[PDB]
Amino acid sequence: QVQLVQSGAEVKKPGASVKVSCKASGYPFTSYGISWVRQAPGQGLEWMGWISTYNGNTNYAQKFQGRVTMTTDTSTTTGYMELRRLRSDDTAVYYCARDYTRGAWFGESLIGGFDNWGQGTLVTVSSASTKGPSVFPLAPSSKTAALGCLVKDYFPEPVTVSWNSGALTSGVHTFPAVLQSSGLYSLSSVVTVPSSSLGTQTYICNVNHKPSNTKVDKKVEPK
Amino acid sequence: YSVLYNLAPFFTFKCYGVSPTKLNDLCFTNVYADSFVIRGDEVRQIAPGQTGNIADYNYKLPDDFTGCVIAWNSNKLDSKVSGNYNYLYRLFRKSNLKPFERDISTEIYQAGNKPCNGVAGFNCYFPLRSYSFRPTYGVGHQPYRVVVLSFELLHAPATVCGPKKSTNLVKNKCVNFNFNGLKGTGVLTESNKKFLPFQQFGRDIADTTDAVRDPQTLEILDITPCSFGGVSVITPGTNTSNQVAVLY
Amino acid sequence: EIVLTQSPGTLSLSPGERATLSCRASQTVSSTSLAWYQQKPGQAPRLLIYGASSRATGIPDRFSGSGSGTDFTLTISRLEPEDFAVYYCQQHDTSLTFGGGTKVEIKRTVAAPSVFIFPPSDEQLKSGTASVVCLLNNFYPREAKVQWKVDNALQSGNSQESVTEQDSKDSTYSLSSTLTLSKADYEKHKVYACEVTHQGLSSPVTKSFNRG
Amino acid sequence: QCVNLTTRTQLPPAYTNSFTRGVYYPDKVFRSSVLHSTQDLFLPFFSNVTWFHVIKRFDNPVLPFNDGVYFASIEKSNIIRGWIFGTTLDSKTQSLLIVNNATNVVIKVCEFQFCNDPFLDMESEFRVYSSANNCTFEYVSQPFLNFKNLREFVFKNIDGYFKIYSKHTPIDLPQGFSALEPLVDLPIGINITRFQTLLALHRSGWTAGAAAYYVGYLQPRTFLLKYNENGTITDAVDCALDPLSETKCTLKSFTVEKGIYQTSNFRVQPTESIVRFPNITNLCPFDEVFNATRFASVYAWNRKRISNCVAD
Numbered sequence: 005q006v007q008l009v010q011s012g013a014e015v016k017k018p019g020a021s022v023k024v025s026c027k028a029s030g031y032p033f034t035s036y037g038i039s040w041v042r043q044a045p046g047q048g049l050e051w052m053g054w055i056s057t058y059n060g061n062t063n064y065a066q067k068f069q070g071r072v073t074m075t076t077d078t079s080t081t082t083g084y085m086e087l088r089r090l091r092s093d094d095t096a097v098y099y100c101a102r103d104y105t106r107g108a109w110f111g112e113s114l115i116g117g118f119d120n121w122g123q124g125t126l127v128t129v130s131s132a133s134t135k136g137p138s139v140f141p142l143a144p145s146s147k148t149a150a151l152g153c154l155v156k157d158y159f160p161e162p163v164t165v166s167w168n169s170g171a172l173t174s175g176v177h178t179f180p181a182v183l184q185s186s187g188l189y190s191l192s193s194v195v196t197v198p199s200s201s202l203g204t205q206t207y208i209c210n211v212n213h214k215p216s217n218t219k220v221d222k223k224v225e226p227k
Numbered sequence: 228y229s230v231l232y233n234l235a236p237f238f239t240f241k242c243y244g245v246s247p248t249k250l251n252d253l254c255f256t257n258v259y260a261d262s263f264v265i266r267g268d269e270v271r272q273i274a275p276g277q278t279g280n281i282a283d284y285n286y287k288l289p290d291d292f293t294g295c296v297i298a299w300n301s302n303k304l305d306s307k308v309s310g311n312y313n314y315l316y317r318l319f320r321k322s323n324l325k326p327f328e329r330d331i332s333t334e335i336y337q338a339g340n341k342p343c344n345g346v347a348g349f350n351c352y353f354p355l356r357s358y359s360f361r362p363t364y365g366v367g368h369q370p371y372r373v374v375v376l377s378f379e380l381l382h383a384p385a386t387v388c389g390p391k392k393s394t395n396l397v398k399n400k401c402v403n404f405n406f407n408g409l410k411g412t413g414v415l416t417e418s419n420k421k422f423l424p425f426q427q428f429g430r431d432i433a434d435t436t437d438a439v440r441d442p443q444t445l446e447i448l449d450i451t452p453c454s455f456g457g458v459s460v461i462t463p464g465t466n467t468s469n470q471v472a473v474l475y
Numbered sequence: 476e477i478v479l480t481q482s483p484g485t486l487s488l489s490p491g492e493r494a495t496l497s498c499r500a501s502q503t504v505s506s507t508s509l510a511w512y513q514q515k516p517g518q519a520p521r522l523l524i525y526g527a528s529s530r531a532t533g534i535p536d537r538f539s540g541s542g543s544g545t546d547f548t549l550t551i552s553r554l555e556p557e558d559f560a561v562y563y564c565q566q567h568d569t570s571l572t573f574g575g576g577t578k579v580e581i582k583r584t585v586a587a588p589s590v591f592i593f594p595p596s597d598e599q600l601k602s603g604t605a606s607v608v609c610l611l612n613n614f615y616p617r618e619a620k621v622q623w624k625v626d627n628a629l630q631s632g633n634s635q636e637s638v639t640e641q642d643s644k645d646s647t648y649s650l651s652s653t654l655t656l657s658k659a660d661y662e663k664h665k666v667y668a669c670e671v672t673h674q675g676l677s678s679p680v681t682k683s684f685n686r687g
Numbered sequence: 688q689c690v691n692l693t694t695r696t697q698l699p700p701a702y703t704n705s706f707t708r709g710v711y712y713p714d715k716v717f718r719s720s721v722l723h724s725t726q727d728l729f730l731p732f733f734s735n736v737t738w739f740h741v742i743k744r745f746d747n748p749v750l751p752f753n754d755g756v757y758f759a760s761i762e763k764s765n766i767i768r769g770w771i772f773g774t775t776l777d778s779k780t781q782s783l784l785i786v787n788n789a790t791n792v793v794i795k796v797c798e799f800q801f802c803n804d805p806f807l808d809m810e811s812e813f814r815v816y817s818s819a820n821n822c823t824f825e826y827v828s829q830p831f832l833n834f835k836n837l838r839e840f841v842f843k844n845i846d847g848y849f850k851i852y853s854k855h856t857p858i859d860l861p862q863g864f865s866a867l868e869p870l871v872d873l874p875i876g877i878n879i880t881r882f883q884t885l886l887a888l889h890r891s892g893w894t895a896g897a898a899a900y901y902v903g904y905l906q907p908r909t910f911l912l913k914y915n916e917n918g919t920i921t922d923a924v925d926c927a928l929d930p931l932s933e934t935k936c937t938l939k940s941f942t943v944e945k946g947i948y949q950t951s952n953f954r955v956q957p958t959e960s961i962v963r964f965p966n967i968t969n970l971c972p973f974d975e976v977f978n979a980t981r982f983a984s985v986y987a988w989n990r991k992r993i994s995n996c997v998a999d
């Protein structure tokens with residue numbers, strides 16, 4: 005079967021250069037070209053460019069005409085993507101695809117499209133350093149009952165949330181992360197429980213952050 | 228060539244000089260692909276020893292053509308409701324085209340004796356004519372895409388052929404050999420001939436291949452047949468004895 | 476360059492109806508240079524139709540494509556629970572262009588939310604800022620309007636909104652609104668309110684809370 | 688950018704004798720100690736070849752490029768550099784060009800816009816063309832390189848393939864035999880009719896050094912070539928020069944004993960052509976149908992049958 009693999013995520017600073025690798029397996033590398041496309045969070049798709057594996061002929065988009073570079077190495081059958089002058093708008097998901105639109109040998113159009121895509125590479129841009137998550141419980145009112153746990157200033161985006169180690173998974177709502185003007189992240193976890201179990205059952209919110217190596221857990225109780 | 232029956236049902240697939248049936252074992256020097264679009268009624272014109280408007284004014288095939296023709300209908304992609312005029316042909320020409328020649332002349336045809344003055348007029352027809360392909364036409368008038376493959380077979384390295392794996396090189400014994408599409412039997416030995424870098428194989432006074440060049444290492448090998456001879460049986464009468472002698 | 480328009484903006488259907496999506500080109504585009512893509516949330520897009528008529532390998536026979544000239548359509552005979560994704564049409568006749576994306580969701584009965592309010596915790600009073608939350612439980616349809624009111628008017632700007640995806644079981648939306656503000660002005664007020672208006676409700680609901 | 692210079696010395700080119708030059712290996716098959724008869728395009732023995740001398744003497748006319756060309760250069764210090772080939776020599780058609788400017792041989796097959804005198808002149812002046820349209824093929828490799836240099840080249844354009852054979856030797860063309868080993872084969876497919884030579888002057892206002900180049904045309908004929916123990920061509924016989932050579936070719940040997948030999952057959956060929964056909968009589972009644980005074984209506988169109996006559 006045809007397989008594609010990519011590199012990991014990057015949290016590099018604005019204005020630097022991004023480097024992405026696209027490794028192919030199970031298909032003749034030279035016979036097919038490589039297409040680079042992006043998808044922004046909250047937006048649709050946006051194709052960037054095409055590179056031919058037979059002679060290195062490339063076709064770029066006019067928006068990134070002065071920032072994009074593609075190369076190929078047939079020894080390891082790896083495509084290399086080098087983008088200069090990275091901006092804050094480059095935070096997106098990058099997709100490497102097998103091109104079946106333009107031929108690699110003659111450079112003419114063909115009936116087809118991107119029939120095989122990679123795993124996707126996350127690109128995040130923010131001029132800030134990492135910081136341990138800050139956790140705050142949210143108790144039910146004095147008067148079903150609901151409660152929660154709000155996390156703020158956790159960087160970068162990858163963070164896991166648990167409630168009693170999955171004992172009460174059914175009933176945990178996790179809203180999508182939201183970014184403020186300070187470059188810091190926010191998230192919330194909401195748990196709905198019967199009003200007859202606020203003072204007896206135990207509810208704990210646990211937040212795990214790998215780059216900062218934190219497993220911080222707090223009890224949530226009514227106030 | 229094994230993966231070729233994976234398109235729409237081909238209406239024309241005719242091969243001259245080589246049998247298509249599982250014969251990707253031949254090594255050729257270069258391959259030429261000639262692609263164009265014609266009408267169904269003109270497909271028969273693409274063959275050796277065929278005369279027609281397309282044959283003498285658009286595309287002529289040699290009488291000794293070594294290669295093949297694949298023509299298939301392309302109505303679903305080259306037929307438009309309003310009419311596709313992008314495909315043109317040549318109907319008027321002074322002399323017939325030579326084989327494998329391209330004519331892009333736009334000069335006005337001098338049908339009569341008076342000059343055409345570079346404009347349309349009497350006895351002055353434009354060489355280019357439009358097919359005007361539409362889906363509502365007949366089978367003969369439907370657009371057809373034709374690809375002609377021409378194979379080159381010369382005394383060349385011939386580095387275009389199928390996926391056949393090579394084995395080790397063994398010398399000093401009668402074996403079956405297949406040196407780059409060239410099959411034979413005999414013993415191969417180290418040759419002491421002063422081959423030149425552009426030369427590939429040698430020849431003898433009896434006009435046969437007696438020397439080859441290994442397509443992997445720059446080595447000249449002499450080819451000789453394995454041992455041979457005649458046998459004679461010497462006997463007295465069977466009325467005398469059953470013993471015999473043998474002369475090689 | 477050429478621009479592709481998708482129709483409609485959002486589809487509300489059921490698992491078993493028939494789906495028809497439209498893509499229109501500003502200029503004339505060859506049918507052979509049009510492709511359809513279906514990207515489910517959480518995985519890379521996959522090709523299903525190329526040439527506007529042919530089917531990609533490993534694609535179920537239910538999906539189909541057609542069209543001509545400047546208008547093309549994608550047809551799904553029956554809808555499956557895994558068939559809800561984001562659909563794109565791409566044309567490469569002149570350079571290469573993609574589409575904004577047509578999203579097809581699940582249509583179900585009209586439900587009502589359980590909007591609650593959560594005042595900031597005590598630990599934020601010594602942190603210099605306080606964050607109050609407004610929660611919207613399982614409701615349908617997604618379109619709901621939320622506002623914050625500090626006891627005398629409508630307020631905006633200082634608020635962040637989060638909306639989840641299609642729910643696994645009930646196919647319902649949950650919404651969150653966060654209002655963060657410094658303690659200096661937080662102590663200047665006692666009563667706050669969150670207002671939620673939804674089609675399911677026959678009247679907008681306002682939930683008010685004081686200090687305590 | 689183009690350079691205007693019309694200081695050419697207008698004089699008729701010389702004519703000289705190509706005794707036994709222009710023999711090249713016709714195939715890549717190795718042979719040894721054998722006499723082989725082959726029909727191909729060769730330069731006929733003892734032929735008239737045009738001679739151009741360059742010294743001021745500056746003559747670079749565009750010469751025809753019939754079926755083949757044999758080029759010879761008597762040279763010292765590398766004045767002759769390259770060549771250009773084409774039919775119109777403009778952007779209308781395809782153009783091919785070779786440069787050997789003592790650095791590396793470069794072949795360029797694209798559309799050009801040449802001036803009225805494309806040539807070259809350290810080396811910091813290239814005035815040949817001013818336009819660069821679409822391109823087809825490119826090639827870069829090792830350079831090909833009293834007078835002491837003799838360079839022989841054979842250029843052929845067969846079935847859209849450009850074949851270049853070459854030979855170099857140290858030294859009126861000298862009498863002797865020297866076969867030309869093949870050098871270059873290119874899949875171009877270019878309609879070539881006219882071609883020009885490339886010079887590089889020695890600026891002092893320049894004074895070109897003494898050089899000579901000869902041009903001959905190839906013709907289709909049969910030759911008998913002799914190979915020694917090593918696979919080298921050492922002698923040849925042109926089977927169409929004189930009766931003795933034709934007898935030698937018939938006997939398949941380079942020596943003839945005394946006697947009389949039935950060599951060939953002679954025949955004369957037609958000069959004109961004539962065609963005779965009976966006459967144009969009893970023409971079909973087309974005038975009666977076309978020039979009828981009264982024509983019937985469309986619903987009652989008049990139908991007539993015409994047979995047994997001449998359809999003019």
Ligand SMILES: *[C@@H]1O[C@H](CO)[C@@H](O)[C@H](O)[C@H]1NC(C)=O
Nearest residue numbers: 384393441442443444445446
């Ligand atoms: C591959 O072919 C080339 C042709 O000259 C030869 O030089 C080289 O040794 C070959 N490689 C192997 C591994 O046989």
Ligand SMILES: *[C@@H]1O[C@H](CO)[C@@H](O)[C@H](O)[C@H]1NC(C)=O
Nearest residue numbers: 688689690691692693802803
């Ligand atoms: C060179 O000679 C041509 C010949 O007429 C003339 O047209 C041109 O102006 C001259 N100068 C240049 C720079 O070409």
Ligand SMILES: *[C@@H]1O[C@H](CO)[C@@H](O)[C@H](O)[C@H]1NC(C)=O
Nearest residue numbers: 702703704705733734735736
């Ligand atoms: C051909 O050569 C002979 C002697 O080599 C010479 O006399 C004659 O003039 C030449 N032909 C022409 C047309 O000059």
Ligand SMILES: *[C@@H]1O[C@H](CO)[C@@H](O)[C@H](O)[C@H]1NC(C)=O
Nearest residue numbers: 786787788789790791793810
């Ligand atoms: C001419 O020679 C120079 C080196 O002196 C080289 O760089 C250049 O490519 C040569 N040009 C041609 C047309 O051969």
Ligand SMILES: *[C@@H]1O[C@H](CO)[C@@H](O)[C@H](O)[C@H]1NC(C)=O
Nearest residue numbers: 778798799818819820821822
């Ligand atoms: C390439 O050829 C086309 C016609 O076939 C011509 O219009 C165009 O100008 C050529 N390219 C250049 C750079 O001149």
Ligand SMILES: *[C@@H]1O[C@H](CO)[C@@H](O)[C@H](O)[C@H]1NC(C)=O
Nearest residue numbers: 325328329330774878879880
């Ligand atoms: C080459 O061009 C000339 C220009 O008139 C033409 O007469 C000739 O037929 C062309 N050759 C071929 C093989 O088409």
Ligand SMILES: *[C@@H]1O[C@H](CO)[C@@H](O)[C@H](O)[C@H]1NC(C)=O
Nearest residue numbers: 421914915916917918919921
């Ligand atoms: C042929 O090659 C041999 C190689 O040793 C050499 O001695 C000889 O001079 C060459 N020529 C002839 C005519 O044998």
